[PDB]
Design a protein around this ligand. Structure first.
Ligand SMILES: OC[C@@H]1O[C@@H](OC[C@@H]2O[C@@H](OC[C@@H]3O[C@@H](OC[C@@H]4O[C@@H](OC[C@@H]5O[C@@H](OC[C@@H]6O[C@@H](OC[C@@H]7O[C@@H](OC[C@@H]8O[C@@H](O)[C@H](O)[C@H]8O)[C@H](O)[C@H]7O)[C@H](O)[C@H]6O)[C@H](O)[C@H]5O)[C@H](O)[C@H]4O)[C@H](O)[C@H]3O)[C@H](O)[C@H]2O)[C@H](O)[C@H]1O
Length: 596
C-alpha cells in the first residue's frame, strides 16, 4: 500500500491535462506524461534535430524566432535555447484549413539576459509535432543598429515585429522610454520576453503573462482566434498606478532589475480570485529559488499578498518582503534516532511552477522542478497538493502528493510532538531545518515555540505562536523517511509566512534515548585512519556527550592520533552518554587506530 514514485527531470514544468493523461512541458524541448501525478514517463528527445519529438526540424521550423535569438547565437553559441513553454487546448483557434481547434505551445527563445522573444506553434496532437505560427513579443532591441559579441544579428528595433504592427495601426510608433540615452534596451522598466503563461479568465477570455527579472512581469490580452496579442496600442497607467505599455502590456509584478520569473496565474471559480504564482531568486543550488504567491480579483491586477502588499516593486529594493513565500529551501533532517535511513527529505531551490486545478474534485496541485541537498545541480519534478485555507489562500502541503485528500480529522490524532519548518521571508542558499514543538491536549503549543492551537470544523488548523496566527489545514501526508502516513499541517499567516508541521511518532524520553542509542553508528571503527565524527545531538534535542578511554589514541571530539610508521596498531574505547530529559542510555564504541 506504500506509494510508488517514478521521477523525471523536466526543467520549468508546465502542466496540462489531456483527457485521462497529465502532461508537463519544460525548457529544452523536454516533456513527460503521467496518469497519477506520481509516476512520470518522459517521451521527448530534447534538443535533438531533426526528428525532434516536438518540433521536427527544429532549426527550419522555428526559424521565424531564431532570426532574433536562441540559435547558435551569443549565450546559445553552438546550441539552441528554447525556454519555459506553456501548452493548452484552444477550442477557438482557426487552423490553416479553416477547421477550429488546436493545441498551442507558447515558447521562449533567448540569446542574452535581455535579447529574447516569445513565439508559438500549433498541432493536431498534444505530443506534437507542433508547427510554427508567429513570433509575437521581442525584447533587447535597440534604437540604432548594433550587435552582441559573437552574434551577427542586427538588434535594431526595425528587425522585430514592431514595424509591421506600426504599419497595421496596432501601435502609434516606437516608445522613447524603451531606450536609454545610448540607445540600448531599457530593461530597468521593460521586460525580458521569456516564460509565457497562458490562462483563461472568468468570462472565458484568453491572456498571456510573461517575463523574467528586468522590468517585471507583463500581461497581454490574447485573440482567442489567431493566438496573437491585442496590443494596448497606447501607453498609460492602471487606476492604481501600475505601468501599461503600448507593446508590452500591463505590469503585474516585479520591476527594477529584481528577481521574479515563472509566472503562473489561475482563476478560482469558487473563491473568485486570480492567484499569481511567481518564483524569486536564482534557479541553481546556491541561488535560492522561492515560490511566491499573490492574488487579485482581476486578471490584470492589482495582485497583492496576504499582507496586502503589491507584487509590483516601488524601485530597486529588496523584493523578499513581497508575496507569500510558499516554499523555500528546507530539510526534514533525519537526526540520530529517527526511523528510516538517509539525511531526510528536503528541497534546494524549488520553483518555476505550474498549477492544476481539478474541475471534478476541486483539488489543486503545485507542479515544479527542484534541486536536492548534497546533489549539486541535479533536479527532478515534484508535485505538492494545495488546500484552500479559511482566508481564500491555497496553502501548500508539506510533502509530495501521494494520493491523500481532505478528511475528517480527530483531535486525538492531532495531539503530539511535531517537527516544524517555518519558511519565513528572507531567502538564500541556506537550507531551513525543523524545530520541535508539540500541540498539547490542553490546546497549548510548547517546546521550541510557545502558543495555542485549534482544530475548527473537519480539518481547519489555526496555529498561534507569539502573537502570529497561521491559518491552514490538518491533512494526512506520506513521510518517505519513516515510510508511514503521518498527521501534518500547513498554515499561512497574514505576514505571508508559511509553517509546516509533520507529526513525530509518540515516544517517551526513555524510548527516545534508546532509539538514539540503537541508531548511533560511527561506521567501521576497526581500521581507523581518519578523524571520526562524533554527533553531539540526536533527535528531539537529545544531547550526546563523549568520553574516551585514552586521549592519546582518540580525543573526546574524535580526533585520532595514528602511531608512527612501523608500530603496532592501537586501541581505545569511546563512550557515548545519551540523555533526553531524565532518561539516559550508554553506548560504547571500540576503536582501533592504524599506524601510518
Ligand atoms: O538523457 C536522458 C535524460 O536526461 C536527463 O535529463 C536531465 C536534463 O538536465 C536538464 O537541464 C536543465 C538545466 O537547466 C537549464 O537552465 C534552465 C533554463 O535556462 C534558464 O535561464 C534563465 C535565466 O535566468 C535568469 O537570470 C536571471 C538574471 O537575469 C540576468 O540578469 C543579469 C543582467 O545584468 C544587468 O545589467 C543591468 C545594469 O544595471 C544598471 O545599473 C545598468 O544601467 C545596466 O546596464 C541586467 O539588468 C540584469 O538582469 C541574469 O541572467 C540573471 O541575473 C534569466 O531570467 C534567464 O537568463 C531558463 O529559465 C531555464 O528554462 C540549463 O541550461 C539546463 O542544463 C534538462 O531539462 C533535463 O532533461 C534525465 O535524467 C535522463 O533520463
Amino acid at each position: 500500500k506504500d506509494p510508488q514514485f517514478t521521477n523525471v527531470s523536466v526543467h520549468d514544468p508546465s502542466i496540462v491535462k489531456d483527457g485521462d493523461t497529465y502532461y508537463i512541458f519544460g525548457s529544452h524541448i523536454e516533456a513527460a506524461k503521467s496518469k497519477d501525478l506520481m509516476n512520470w514517463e518522459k517521451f521527448t528527445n530534447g534538443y535533438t534535430t531533426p526528428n525532434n519529438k516536438l518540433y521536427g526540424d527544429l532549426s527550419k521550423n522555428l526559424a521565424g524566432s531564431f532570426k532574433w535569438a536562441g540559435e547558435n547565437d551569443a549565450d546559445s553559441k553552438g546550441g539552441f535555447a528554447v525556454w519555459a513553454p506553456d501548452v493548452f487546448w484552444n477550442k477557438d483557434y482557426v487552423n490553416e484549413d479553416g477547421t477550429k481547434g488546436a493545441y498551442m505551445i507558447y515558447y521562449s527563445v533567448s540569446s542574452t539576459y535581455i535579447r529574447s522573444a516569445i513565439g508559438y506553434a500549433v498541432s493536431k496532437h498534444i505530443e506534437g509535432p507542433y508547427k510554427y505560427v508567429d513570433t509575437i513579443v521581442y525584447s533587447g532591441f535597440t534604437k540604432e543598429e548594433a550587435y552582441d559579441a559573437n552574434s551577427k544579428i542586427n538588434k535594431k528595433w526595425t528587425n522585430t515585429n514592431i514595424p509591421k504592427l506600426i504599419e497595421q495601426g496596432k501601435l502609434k510608433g516606437v516608445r522613447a522610454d524603451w531606450f536609454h540615452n545610448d540607445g540600448s534596451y531599457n530593461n530597468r522598466d521593460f521586460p525580458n520576453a521569456i516564460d509565457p503563461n497562458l490562462f483563461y479568465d472568468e468570462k472565458g477570455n484568453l491572456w498571456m503573462a510573461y517575463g523574467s527579472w528586468s522590468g517585471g512581469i507583463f500581461v497581454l490580452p490574447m485573440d482567442k482566434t489567431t493566438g496573437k496579442p491585442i496590443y494596448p496600442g497606447k501607453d498609460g497607467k492602471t487606476p492604481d498606478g501600475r505601468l501599461v505599455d503600448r507593446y508590452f502590456g500591463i505590469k503585474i509584478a516585479g520591476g527594477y532589475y529584481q528577481s521574479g520569473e515563472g509566472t503562473y496565474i489561475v482563476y478560482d471559480k469558487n473563491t473568485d480570485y486570480y492567484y499569481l504564482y511567481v518564483t524569486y531568486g536564482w534557479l541553481g543550488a546556491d541561488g535560492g529559488y522561492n515560490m511566491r504567491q499573490f492574488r487579485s480579483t482581476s486578471p490584470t491586477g492589482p495582485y497583492v499578498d496576504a499582507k496586502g502588499q503589491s507584487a509590483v516593486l516601488p524601485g530597486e529594493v529588496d523584493n523578499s518582503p513581497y508575496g507569500n513565500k510558499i516554499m523555500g529551501n528546507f530539510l526534514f533532517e533525519r537526526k540520530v534516532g529517527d526511523p528510516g535511513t538517509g539525511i531526510g527529505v528536503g528541497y534546494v531551490s524549488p520553483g518555476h511552477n505550474s498549477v492544476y486545478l481539478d474541475r471534478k474534485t476541486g483539488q489543486q496541485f503545485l507542479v515544479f522542478h527542484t534541486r536536492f541537498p548534497q546533489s549539486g545541480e541535479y533536479h527532478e519534478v515534484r508535485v505538492h497538493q494545495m488546500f484552500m485555507n479559511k482566508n481564500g489562500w491555497p496553502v501548500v502541503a508539506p510533502y509530495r502528493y501521494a494520493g491523500e485528500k481532505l478528511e475528517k480529522v480527530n483531535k486525538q490524532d492531532v495531539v503530539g510532538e511535531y517537527q516544524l519548518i517555518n519558511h519565513g521571508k528572507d531567502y538564500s542558499a541556506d537550507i531551513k531545518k525543523q524545530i520541535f514543538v508539540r500541540l498539547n491536549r490542553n490546546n497549548t503549543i510548547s517546546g521550541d515555540a510557545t502558543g495555542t492551537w485549534r482544530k475548527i470544523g473537519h480539518n481547519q488548523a489555526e496555529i498561534t505562536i507569539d502573537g502570529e496566527t497561521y491559518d491552514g489545514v490538518f491533512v494526512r501526508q506520506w513521510d518517505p523517511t519513516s515510510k508511514r502516513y503521518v498527521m501534518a499541517f500547513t498554515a499561512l499567516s497574514n505576514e505571508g509566512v508559511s509553517i509546516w508541521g509533520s507529526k513525530l511518532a509518540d515516544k517517551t524520553d526513555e524510548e527516545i534515548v534508546e532509539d538514539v542509542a540503537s541508531d548511533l553508528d560511527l561506521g567501521d571503527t576497526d581500521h581507523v585512519v581518519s578523524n571520526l565524527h562524533l554527533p553531539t545531538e540526536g533527535t528531539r534535542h537529545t544531547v550526546i556527550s563523549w568520553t574516551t578511554s585514552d586521549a592519546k589514541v582518540v580525543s573526546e571530539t574524535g580526533v585520532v592520533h595514528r602511531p608512527e610508521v612501523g608500530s603496532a596498531p592501537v586501541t581505545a574505547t569511546l563512550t557515548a552518554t545519551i540523555t533526553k530529559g531524565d532518561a539516559t542510555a550508554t553506548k560504547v564504541f571500540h576503536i582501533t587506530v592504524l599506524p601510518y
